[PDB]
Write an enzyme that holds these catalytic residues in place. Structure first.
Site, PDB file in Angstrom:
ATOM      1  N   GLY A 265       0.819  -1.207   0.000  1.00  0.00           N
ATOM      2  CA  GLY A 265       0.000   0.000   0.000  1.00  0.00           C
ATOM      3  C   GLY A 265       0.850   1.253   0.000  1.00  0.00           C
ATOM      4  O   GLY A 265       2.034   1.195  -0.348  1.00  0.00           O
TER       5      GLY A 265
ATOM      6  N   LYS B  43       8.914   0.526   4.242  1.00  0.00           N
ATOM      7  CA  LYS B  43       8.239   1.740   3.816  1.00  0.00           C
ATOM      8  C   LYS B  43       9.277   2.736   3.351  1.00  0.00           C
ATOM      9  O   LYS B  43      10.244   3.003   4.067  1.00  0.00           O
ATOM     10  CB  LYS B  43       7.324   2.320   4.907  1.00  0.00           C
ATOM     11  CG  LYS B  43       7.973   2.915   6.134  1.00  0.00           C
ATOM     12  CD  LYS B  43       6.879   3.386   7.110  1.00  0.00           C
ATOM     13  CE  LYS B  43       7.454   3.740   8.453  1.00  0.00           C
ATOM     14  NZ  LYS B  43       6.501   4.542   9.269  1.00  0.00           N
TER      15      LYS B  43
ATOM     16  N   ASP C 206      -2.074   9.452  17.762  1.00  0.00           N
ATOM     17  CA  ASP C 206      -2.851   9.073  16.563  1.00  0.00           C
ATOM     18  C   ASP C 206      -3.269   7.608  16.582  1.00  0.00           C
ATOM     19  O   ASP C 206      -3.218   6.914  15.574  1.00  0.00           O
ATOM     20  CB  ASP C 206      -2.136   9.454  15.279  1.00  0.00           C
ATOM     21  CG  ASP C 206      -3.051   9.647  14.095  1.00  0.00           C
ATOM     22  OD1 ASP C 206      -4.278   9.780  14.308  1.00  0.00           O
ATOM     23  OD2 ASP C 206      -2.577   9.486  12.970  1.00  0.00           O
TER      24      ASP C 206
HETATM   25  N1  LIG Z   1       3.342  11.788   7.689  1.00  0.00           N
HETATM   26  C1  LIG Z   1       3.746  10.878   8.590  1.00  0.00           C
HETATM   27  N2  LIG Z   1       2.929  10.341   9.492  1.00  0.00           N
HETATM   28  N3  LIG Z   1       3.686   9.455  10.199  1.00  0.00           N
HETATM   29  C2  LIG Z   1       4.974   9.426   9.770  1.00  0.00           C
HETATM   30  C3  LIG Z   1       6.085   8.700  10.193  1.00  0.00           C
HETATM   31  C4  LIG Z   1       7.294   8.871   9.536  1.00  0.00           C
HETATM   32  C5  LIG Z   1       7.409   9.769   8.481  1.00  0.00           C
HETATM   33  C6  LIG Z   1       6.300  10.496   8.083  1.00  0.00           C
HETATM   34 CL1  LIG Z   1       6.450  11.607   6.755  1.00  0.00          CL
HETATM   35  C7  LIG Z   1       5.071  10.347   8.712  1.00  0.00           C
HETATM   36  N1  LIG Z   2       1.999  -4.718   6.683  1.00  0.00           N
HETATM   37  C1  LIG Z   2       2.917  -4.204   7.500  1.00  0.00           C
HETATM   38  N2  LIG Z   2       3.725  -4.958   8.234  1.00  0.00           N
HETATM   39  N3  LIG Z   2       4.527  -4.086   8.916  1.00  0.00           N
HETATM   40  C2  LIG Z   2       4.244  -2.790   8.615  1.00  0.00           C
HETATM   41  C3  LIG Z   2       4.787  -1.587   9.061  1.00  0.00           C
HETATM   42  C4  LIG Z   2       4.288  -0.392   8.559  1.00  0.00           C
HETATM   43  C5  LIG Z   2       3.255  -0.388   7.628  1.00  0.00           C
HETATM   44  C6  LIG Z   2       2.713  -1.591   7.203  1.00  0.00           C
HETATM   45 CL1  LIG Z   2       1.419  -1.562   6.044  1.00  0.00          CL
HETATM   46  C7  LIG Z   2       3.189  -2.810   7.681  1.00  0.00           C
END
Ligand SMILES: Nc1n[nH]c2cccc(Cl)c12
Ligand SMILES: Nc1n[nH]c2cccc(Cl)c12
Length: 339
Positions: free
Chosen positions: A22, A44, A139
């Site tokens: 995603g 990510k 959050d």
């Molecule tokens: N926009 C964001 N919400 N949460 C985050 C964590 C790391 C880096 C970013 Cl940019 C974000």
């Molecule tokens: N599927 C996921 N396993 N671990 C994550 C960490 C950040 C965001 C996501 Cl979507 C995942």
């Protein structure tokens, strides 16, 4: 460089065989095969460096998740970036792969009362640790609760976190946008900057309500609507609770409203465990000073099959322009470079 949807996703050679999962906060998320640990992992890609607010959030999250170590909090396994500040345009954060999240599950699955209990236990266990570090998540919502195939739960996304600061929490009316709307405590709209631990407990309450029915409890259509939904269920605040709001704009708004009776939790949630509704009531208290705290919530009868304070650990160590924030992100990620 590995490519995913014609965008660089550059993590190799340690990480291969990528699949698009995603899109994260601002950047792509993929699974990948980790050739060292021989497991699939989540990765990510963050491209924050032109925007000071993405730099801030990236650095908070990195700093917090590298210090925290807890079974119910996502870790960082690895961070990938270019070897020099000049060449570094993107940062990749490698985390345990989790099958799903509570947002996705609630859209598709009825939860048994045993699942609701266990999920809530894990949420609060992780929250105990975060709060014990004097950190506020700020959050908490179903999509920030990751789950694996055996229903182990991990809290993620610390980009919006802050260090608690209760003495500087007060502000004016309709100014503040802490949290995601549906999970935002009433006081955010009235007189709170979201710098106290009670902000997270409200969100957990909202999540518990949502586990009970598969629908958000307070689905405000827009920012201003969110109060309408909260007061619609809790009813009009008491005199004592209004007397705690000293700001006149906020107080007088509340006083302007027609009387609203409390909707009983057992009518909204007729299939719910009565102990779960007693805890829900206590987490969704209007007055943040009267709201239950994380350690009380863990000790609540609903969680008696799990509660064990000796196995609910606490943190050992409680807790700028974009060019300096790039340098700090560079320094913070240096431990993961060959060296
Ligand atoms: N926009 C964001 N919400 N949460 C985050 C964590 C790391 C880096 C970013 Cl940019 C974000
Ligand atoms: N599927 C996921 N396993 N671990 C994550 C960490 C950040 C965001 C996501 Cl979507 C995942």
């Amino acid at each position: 460089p590995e490519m995913v949807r014609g965008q660089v996703f550059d993590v190799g050679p340690r990480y291969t065989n990528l699949s698009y999962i995603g899109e994260g906060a601002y950047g792509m998320v993929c699974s990948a095969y980790d050739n060292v640990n021989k497991v699939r992992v989540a990765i990510k890609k963050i491209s924050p460096f032109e925007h000071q607010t993405y730099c801030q959030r990236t650095l908070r999250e990195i700093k917090i998740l590298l210090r925290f170590r807890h079974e119910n909090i996502i870790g960082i396994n690895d961070i990938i970036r270019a070897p020099t500040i000049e060449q570094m345009k993107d940062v990749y954060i490698v985390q345990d792969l989790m099958e799903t999240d509570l947002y996705k599950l609630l859209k598709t699955q009825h939860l048994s009362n045993d699942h609701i209990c266990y999920f809530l236990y894990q949420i609060l266990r992780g929250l105990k640790y975060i709060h014990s570090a004097n950190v506020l998540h700020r959050d908490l919502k179903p999509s920030n609760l990751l789950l694996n195939t055996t229903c182990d739960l991990k809290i993620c996304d610390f980009g919006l976190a802050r260090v608690a600061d209760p003495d500087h929490d007060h502000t004016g009316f309709l100014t503040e946008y802490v949290a995601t709307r549906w999970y935002r405590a009433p006081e955010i709209m009235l007189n709170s900057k979201g710098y106290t631990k009670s902000i997270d407990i409200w969100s957990v309450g909202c999540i518990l309500a949502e586990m009970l029915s598969n629908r958000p409890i307070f689905p405000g259509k827009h920012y201003l609507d969110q109060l309408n939904h909260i007061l619609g269920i809790l009813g009009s605040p008491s005199q004592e609770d209004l007397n705690c709001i000293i700001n006149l704009k906020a107080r007088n708004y509340l006083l302007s409203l027609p009387h609203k009776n409390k909707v009983p939790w057992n009518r909204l949630f007729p299939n719910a465990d009565s102990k779960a509704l007693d805890l829900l009531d206590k987490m969704l208290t209007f007055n943040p000073h009267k709201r239950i705290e994380v350690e009380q919530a863990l000790a609540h009868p609903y969680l008696e099959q799990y509660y064990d304070p000796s196995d609910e650990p606490i943190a050992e160590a409680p807790f700028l322009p974009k060019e300096k924030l790039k340098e700090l992100i560079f320094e913070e990620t240096a431990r993961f470079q060959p060296g």
